Paper text:
We describe here the first crystal structure of a bacterial tyrosine kinase, namely CapB from the pathogen Staphylococcus aureus, in complex with the cytoplasmic domain of the transmembrane stimulatory protein CapA. Reproducing the Gram-negative organization of BY-kinases by direct linkage of the Cap5A1Ct fragment (herein called CapACt) to the N-terminal extremity of Cap5B2 (herein called CapB) allowed the production of a fully active soluble protein called CapAB. The CapB kinase core possesses a P-loop type α/β mononucleotide binding fold.
The structure of the inactive P-loop CapAB(K55M) mutant was determined to 2.6Å resolution. It presents a subunit fold highly similar to that of the CapAB wild-type protein with an rmsd of 0.67 Å over 241 aligned residues. The total surface contact area of about 2,000 Å between two neighbouring subunits is characteristic of biological interactions. Residues 216b–228b of the tyrosine cluster that were disordered in the phosphorylated wild-type structure form a long loop with Y225b side chain fitting in the active site of the neighbouring CapB molecule. The side chain of Y225b is bound in the active site of the neighbour subunit via hydrophobic sandwich interactions with the side chain of K82b and the two consecutive proline residues P159b–P160b forming an extended hhhhDTPP Walker B motif characteristic of the BY-kinase subfamily of P-loop ATPases. The hydroxyl group of Y225b is pointing toward the 4.8 Å distant β-phosphate of the bound ADP molecule. Despite the absence of a nucleotide in the crystallization solution, ADP-Mg is observed in the P-loop of the CapAB(K55M) mutant protein. This is in agreement with a previous study showing that in P-loop proteins, this mutation inhibits the phosphate transfer but increases the affinity of the protein for the nucleotide.
Numbering used by the authors:
A (entry chain B), C (entry chain B), E (entry chain B), H (entry chain B): 197 to 222, 1001 to 1228
B (entry chain A), D (entry chain A), F (entry chain A), G (entry chain A): 197 to 222, 1001 to 1226
């Protein structure tokens, strides 16, 4: 079966740059992590080093003006969006950006597990004014990283996104944070990630290398680009362990 | 075998963007909805989610200035025109647009059946000046959706459309709704859809993937463009149930 | 034998749009009419619906300015010109245009049979000042439709057309009518339809689908275009009963 | 077999519009006319109708400004030059143009035979100043058609054409007629036609489909263009009687 | 052998127009002439009619300004130059141009035989001031035609041509004559015809159809064009009697 | 067999100029040098001469304005980065430029081994503000060459590079040296090299002809260009000893 | 078989106009001339006539402004340089130009043999300032032709050419002659011809059709163009005696 | 084996003009010289005549401004650089240029043998200020020719070249000399000839026809051109004795 796969495939099928490749987490490239927050728990690891790669290429993909927010999305469920988003967030934090990860998936949120946080209040309650700005965002044990978790599952998630309420939040967010990452649901599945892109204008696209359909990843791209926002590039996730390239190797007196 | 079957066939045969695909209804993808007004019955079903997609990229398809009104048409009857019109209207309303749906099908209307409303007074009688504006538009149970039903079957539907009464009514509607969707008869069959199209300059074209003749389809396309209107794009209907297909996952 | 035929043929041979197709009148698409004035006598019929198609596409073929007059013509005798012209006239009437059909065929006039009217006075007597403006035009039992029949057969029909007399009439006609249809003789046969086109500038071309020669229809086109007037498109007439397309079908609770 | 046979062959061999086709006379298409001046004898015959066509699209072939004068010529004798000249003149007159036909064939004139007029005085004697203008042009039975006959065969026809007397006469004619048609000798044979052409800048070129050599034909074409004149187009003559062919129906 | 031949050959090899074709003088196309001055002695003949053809096409080859002088020349001896030149001169005369034929062949002059005149004084003696302007030009029995014959054979003919003396004569000639024809020697053989062209700027080129070499006729052309003067076209001479074309036929009640 | 082997393979695979080739060291081409700092040990050896070449045409590769600082990097470890950095620094100093070499490899530094210097204080501790500028840069035995060693292995090398302390330090360095060369870790492995590159806008890219994968090589190329930096060109390393090859004659 | 044989071969091999062809002398085409100065001995011979051709179209080859001076050269010795130079000079004089011919061949001069003049004083001694201008140029029997002979063979011919004395002399010559032709040594062999060419900017290039190597010939061509000079064109020499060939008729 | 060879090869491989070809010195084309200073010792010889060829083509390769200095260089040792340079220098002298040959090869200098001169002081000592301007340049027995020999072998030759000291010398040199030839070491071997080119801007390139590698001569060219200086052309040296061409022949009464 014909999927994408590796950096050449991306080039050929999507005509976009690969910002970085993660490597399906084994015990070598993560220095055995328990949680999937590799950048926090094993910061000198090759996979962590790839995240830093992505961080950089994001700032590089756009000179003249610093990019202060992204949507992370993909064509389909379980591609790694949530995982990419969190590690990337941590990377941003480590470099002294005041960093907000936002859980804009108000349908199957995972940020609150990843960072292991209560989800009584969050984006949804925030936008409905069920909860307050100070109470809804939490500061984590990771310096310079806050999380705005999804909040209760609303009945009308996409409509919450297209509201002055969100427009207003988003404006408030870019005043108070140097970098904003919005985790979203898959773009083929619900329109959510489109509407988030309309605000950010920059999208990072996660393609699950182990499992995808060439044409859907194609329609995801076209759905993002339809909003007019810039697709900064791709992160290939769940890449096979090579790891003869180096690229994947560990570098530092061991 | 001459059918436009999928979004490739649209690209290739008509050169148009596909705004969304609606699959053939089933209990799963409608999430057990009991009518065809699925965006209202089962707001969180995949079929509904796809209507939000259409909603979304209708809006993107014309950046700088909003799209205020569309026509919904198709090359033939039974393609889903009325059903897509009604659902799309519900989706818009949920997005918080003051929406009107107009049954511009004064020959075989169905909006009164969709929204289970009376149809004594409506578009025709409004136009013939035999009923008032406020008497003719009804507010539904659905927040922010009004319906201007077709009214009685007039003897001259299309001549009513190009009358000065509809032009006045149309300006009036644009003062009073953020979004106006006009259901129509098929465009190959009678002009009506064309006339409406001239007023909206914006058309969503429904193609019933399950049963269509590709030549008749591009013919509806040329009949629309002739009006000067913009074809925002195609909606595919009755698509075959790929559901394999992360386009149609229940999430979650 | 190689004739035109159907919409594709028109496209290929003439490089012009088809404004509409009539269907050879049977009992189904006309709801049995006696007279050939289908738009008057069976207004909710598919053939009548096609005429309305044509009406529309005529107004569409020319934005910036409304088209207030046409010549209807064809390559050859018995193509349907006269029949198209009358039904179209009626369609225009039904839509509240004040509509004059003019019988500019002063050699084999048929309008006076179609509408069943006396032909003692008409265009020819009008132009010669044998008859008066008020007496020469008749109002029919069809609201908003008048007919100016041909008048007596003159000896010099084409010369009557190229006269200040006609220029003057034509000017008077566009003051008093919202829409003017001029029926003419075949353009391959006599120059008449050219000279009428020089005034109107818009020509509707009737091709008899059952019976024509590809090349003559071609020379008709070139003869019209030689006058500088716009050929708005084609009406294919006498089309075979398909009627699996729909396009030809009846639409409305029966 | 090297003949230019039909309007395709014109297009292809000469790149010119065909202003009309005249078929080989017969009782039907002349409607039993008793002379060759058919536009006058049998005004309503198909052959005549075709002359009205030529008339018409002579006029269209040069929009913005009228065409006031033409030359009629051909590559060879017996092609129909004189006959088309005379009929075309009648057609113009019926259209109500004050027309003059000039027999510029001072070698083998035939306009005096066509219009059965005397030929004592005429173009030559006018030019040599041996007869007056008013004495030389005659008014025919036909309303609005004058004929300036060739006059006696002079010893130097072409040198008369480029004389200052013809230039003066020519300006004079243009003051006095809405339309002036000059019949000429064939253009391959002697210059005369060329000289006239320089004065009219407008030429109708007759090609006798029944008998012609295609190379000699394009050669007449280059001989004309050399003058700077416009070739308004071709008239085909002696065409073979398609009559099947709604071009040549009697209507009616 | 490959020579030129007919009008098509000229087109192909020289890319120039044919101004006219003479026909090798027989008894039919000349109405039996004794002398080779056909235009004078049999003026209504087909060959004479061809000369008139040439006359016309010369005036036609150059609008904006009338062409008041030509050089007649060719690639090679006995092509007909002298014969063309004289008849053409006569044609010009007959049309009321005051016409000077000049015998610029001061090496094998023939004009004085053609017109049968004394050659004691002429161009050569004129330029050397051996003879006077009034005595050196003769008026012939042909109205409006004068001849300036060659004069005695000088030792330095080409140098006489490139002199202020000639420049001066030439200027005087264009004041007193409406048309000037200069007969010259063959352009491949001596430079004479080049230098005459530098004054006239218009050259008529005579190709002997019976006898020539394709490539030399080519070099003649290039030699003329090198002076910058306009080659108005070609006269094909000594053409075969066809005379089925007509073109060659006689036209006028016989 | 997928290696970039020679300057043809550079041209073809990467489209870049080759600034110089360094062959695999031997007693002849190093002229019996006892360390790898050959430009200093054996200033007149061919290998050294080739470093002067690189020096030279670094400078030509950017005419109008001098190149003040470069990054040295490569797609993989063991390619010669550190060695070319150090020698190139010596060459520059001999040319009389006040040169600084910065060990920007805060993971596996080797500049302290090359120049046999202590590495207690250096880039890291400077950046963390735990040691002073004058304490951190050392002046070597070599006239006009200072070395800013890596300092202790910090826990966060790349985050130190994009800190405001390095930006300040970097401006400071440019005030104080005519030429600054930054050794780095391989560019495929960790970002560091990219970050430095953004500051210099000038990169010399080392390709180890003896052992490399051509795809990984162009990948380092794209990783560099992404920064906006100029790739001045390639240095080939460990080239195979053509010495036949007047490129590598001992002259004399 | 690698020879440039005819004017086709010139066109094709060198892209140049042929100003004239000189055939191999014989009693007929020289008309029994007793020396090689044929334009003077036998002014009316075909060979002479052809020199008038060259004369003529030298002048045409540069319209707007006269050509005042040329160099005559060739790729090899024995090609006819001196002979064409001398005759061309005579032709010019007969045309009434105050002509000077300069023997710029101070190695193997022959102008003194052609014009049978003494050669004690001349170009060299003039340049070295060992003889005066008026002493060095001689007036020949031939009206309007002076000859500046080569003078004694100097030890440094080319260094004399680029001296400031020749520049002064050259300006002086241009004040004093309407036309100056410089004979030279072959251009492949020694620079002299090049130097002269820089002063005239005008070159006539002689190619000896009877014996030449086509590569050496285009090489003389590039050697000339290098100077910036105009190559007015080729003279072909020793052509084979077509005489069949109206180019070479005796007329008459 | 594939080397260059002859003038066509240069054209094909280098896309540059050949300024001249020397001929491997035998007893014929040198009139037997002992020393390799042919232009001095056998000035009327064919090889000497070729040098004069080069001289000229150098002045020709660059109009608008006279070229007052060159670097002579080549791809590789023993190509003839030094020999070309000296003879060329002499040629320049003979034409009354005040001519300095500079020995910029401070690694294997040969100028001092060629001209047979002491090498205690020269360029190297000059630049280090070990020696004076007046003492370091010597006037030879050849009128108008001075030599600045290399001086002692310095430890850092290339650095001496890139110094204000050299910049200053070079400036002083172009004030006092009409023409400056700098002999250099091979450009593939040491960077020296590049740095000399940066000052002169014009380079003459010597290719040893008997012995070279096509590709290295190619890299030499690219190395010169990298400095931005003009490569004026090539001198092919050590060319085979043909000498049927002529080009190589002797011209002058023998
Ligand atoms: Mg997710
Ligand atoms: Mg419906
Ligand atoms: Mg009719
Ligand atoms: Mg006639
Ligand atoms: Mg002659
Ligand atoms: Mg390293
Ligand atoms: Mg000589
Ligand atoms: Mg050397």
């Amino acid at each position: 079966d014909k999927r994408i796969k590796d950096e050449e495939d991306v080039e050929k099928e999507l005509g976009l740059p690969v910002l970085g490749s993660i490597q399906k987490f084994n015990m070598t490239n993560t220095r055995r992590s328990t949680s999937s927050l590799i950048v926090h728990e094993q910061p000198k690891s090759p996979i962590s080093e790839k995240f830093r790669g992505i961080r950089s290429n994001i700032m590089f993909a756009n000179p003249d003006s610093a990019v202060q927010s992204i949507v992370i999305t993909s064509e389909a469920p379980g591609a790694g969006m949530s995982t990419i988003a969190a590690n990337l967030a941590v990377a941003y934090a480590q470099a002294g950006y005041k960093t907000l990860i936002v859980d804009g998936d108000m349908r199957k949120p995972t940020q609150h597990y990843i960072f292991n946080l209560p989800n009584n209040e969050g984006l949804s309650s925030l936008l409905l004014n069920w909860s307050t700005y100070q109470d809804s965002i939490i500061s984590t044990e990771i310096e310079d990283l806050d999380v705005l978790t999804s909040g209760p599952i609303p009945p009308n998630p996409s409509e919450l996104i297209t509201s002055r309420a969100f427009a207003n939040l988003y404006d408030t967010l870019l005043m108070n944070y140097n970098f904003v990452i919005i985790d979203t649901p898959p773009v083929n599945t619900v329109t959510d990630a489109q509407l988030f892109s309309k605000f950010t204008g920059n999208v990072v696209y996660v393609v699950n290398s182990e499992n995808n359909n060439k044409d859907e990843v194609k329609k995801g791209k076209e759905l993002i680009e339809a909003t007019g926002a810039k697709l900064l590039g791709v992160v290939l996730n769940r890449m096979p362990k090579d790891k003869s390239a180096s690229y994947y190797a560990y570098y530092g007196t061991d």
